Amino acid sequence: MHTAEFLETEPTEISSVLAGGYNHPLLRQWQSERQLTKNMLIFPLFISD
Amino acid sequence: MHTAEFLETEPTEISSVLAGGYNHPLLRQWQSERQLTKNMLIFPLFISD
């Protein structure tokens, strides 16, 4: 019958491995080139006569 | 006697004027390509046996 085929694979190339940089919550913050802060915000006001 | 000499000057070139981008406290924050946050910090610990 139909079984799971697994192909014969080569050793892992280092060039392939990205996962060491984003396996933890703090890392997905280390990965941002800029973080959102309060002073970045600009709020529109619509002023009536 | 010695008085203040002022040279005859040309109209201001727009290319010269940088000051409109950093005349206020909030601007010198808008001018930073990254701001310091707490999660950026890493504290060393020296552990004794």
Side-chain angles (χ1 to χ4, degrees):
Chain A
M1 51 183 234
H2 179 54
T3 66
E5 183 180 9
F6 295 84
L7 297 196
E8 177 108 42
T9 180
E10 283 168 274
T12 304
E13 287 244 55
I14 281 155
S15 65
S16 301
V17 175
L18 297 206
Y22 61 109
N23 48 71
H24 183 277
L26 182 64
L27 289 184
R28 302 191 285 258
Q29 323 197 163
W30 283 17
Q31 290 297 342
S32 96
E33 333 141 86
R34 162 183 305 112
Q35 314 187 30
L36 176 50
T37 57
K38 280 172 170 190
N39 62 200
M40 304 188 164
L41 301 167
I42 305 159
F43 193 41
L45 298 172
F46 298 78
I47 319 266
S48 200
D49 42 8
Chain B
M1 51 183 234
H2 179 54
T3 66
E5 183 180 9
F6 295 84
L7 297 196
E8 177 108 42
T9 180
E10 283 168 274
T12 304
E13 287 244 55
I14 281 155
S15 65
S16 301
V17 175
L18 297 206
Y22 61 109
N23 48 71
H24 183 277
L26 182 64
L27 289 184
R28 302 191 285 258
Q29 323 197 163
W30 283 17
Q31 290 297 342
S32 96
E33 333 141 86
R34 162 183 305 112
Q35 314 187 30
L36 176 50
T37 57
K38 280 172 170 190
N39 62 200
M40 304 188 164
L41 301 167
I42 305 159
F43 193 41
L45 298 172
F46 298 78
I47 319 266
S48 200
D49 42 8

